[PDB]
């Protein structure tokens, strides 16, 4: 199947004293493998999956140097943005950046991304062709001009199509035992009576990897979305994911309702019934 490498960065300014709080995290697919937290004592990029501990001291030195450089760029950005938006020194503000690459089942490049937000809103983003920029407002337009003059898109394109995909392949291979393994959802159904006339059926999916999944209900073999509740996919905490979907039905009519589960780890979608 498809795979991705993604990095997420958040900087939050601290009015009154010192530098912003900066947190960087890296993922392969749904697996975190590295972190940096400016509040942490080590001041090093740290491993978060065993397969990355294969990399030597040089790797850790390099990733530490780059991530600290990312942090400094964000520090300067917070001040520049305060200026662009005519804001005071009083309030805390946030910058977020995400970048990375997607590859298909053949591990060949599919697409790349580099997006940036200020105070939770779009600021500037690399377009899909990796050649130009989407700037949301006039401040971001000024940034766009700066980044055009500096040929930032060209640099990012080379990293996204090259280094990104190359190291994603590396990580996939080194972490094959987990990264290339799919964990099919373990499914069950529960039942609850609301009143003498109404029941809830809840269809559960547990212990799955990767996170992508689809759970649906059918009534007499037809898709049923009314009177259903579908929760956000949530981490179990052990690297797997959980989700459920529920339906409200007339008491006694449970047999008409079927749950349908699609996941990469299931060679064919699974069906569950109450009985």
């Amino acid at each position: 199947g498809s795979h991705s490498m993604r990095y997420f960065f958040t900087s939050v300014s601290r009015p009154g004293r010192g530098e912003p709080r900066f947190i960087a995290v890296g993922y392969v697919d749904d697996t975190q493998f590295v972190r940096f937290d400016s509040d942490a004592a080590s001041q090093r990029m740290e491993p978060r999956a065993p397969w990355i501990e294969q990399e030597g001291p040089e790797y850790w030195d390099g990733e530490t140097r780059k991530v600290k450089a990312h942090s400094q760029t964000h520090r300067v950005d917070l001040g520049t943005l305060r200026g662009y938006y005519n804001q005071s020194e009083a309030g805390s503000h946030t910058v977020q950046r995400m970048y990375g690459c997607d590859v298909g089942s053949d591990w060949r490049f599919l697409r790349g991304y580099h997006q940036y937000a200020y105070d939770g809103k779009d600021y500037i983003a690399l377009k899909e062709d990796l050649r130009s920029w989407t700037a949301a407002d006039m401040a971001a337009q000024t940034t766009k001009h700066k980044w055009e003059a500096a040929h930032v898109a060209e640099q990012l394109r080379a990293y996204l199509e090259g280094t990104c995909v190359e190291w994603l392949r590396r990580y996939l291979e080194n972490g094959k035992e987990t990264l290339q393994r799919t964990d099919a959802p373990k499914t069950h159904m529960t039942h609850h009576a609301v009143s003498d006339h109404e029941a809830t059926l809840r269809c559960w999916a547990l212990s799955f990897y990767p996170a992508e999944i689809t759970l649906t209900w059918q009534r007499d073999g037809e898709d049923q979305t009314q009177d259903t509740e579908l929760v956000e996919t949530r981490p179990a905490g052990d690297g797997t994911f959980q989700k459920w979907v529920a339906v409200v039905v007339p008491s006694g009519q449970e047999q008409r309702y079927t749950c349908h589960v699609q996941h990469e780890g299931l060679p064919k979608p699974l069906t569950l019934r109450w009985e």
Partner: peptide
């Protein structure tokens, strides 16, 4: 593997 440089806004 992180990009080897970012650019200020």
């Amino acid at each position: 593997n992180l990009v080897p440089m970012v650019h200020t806004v």
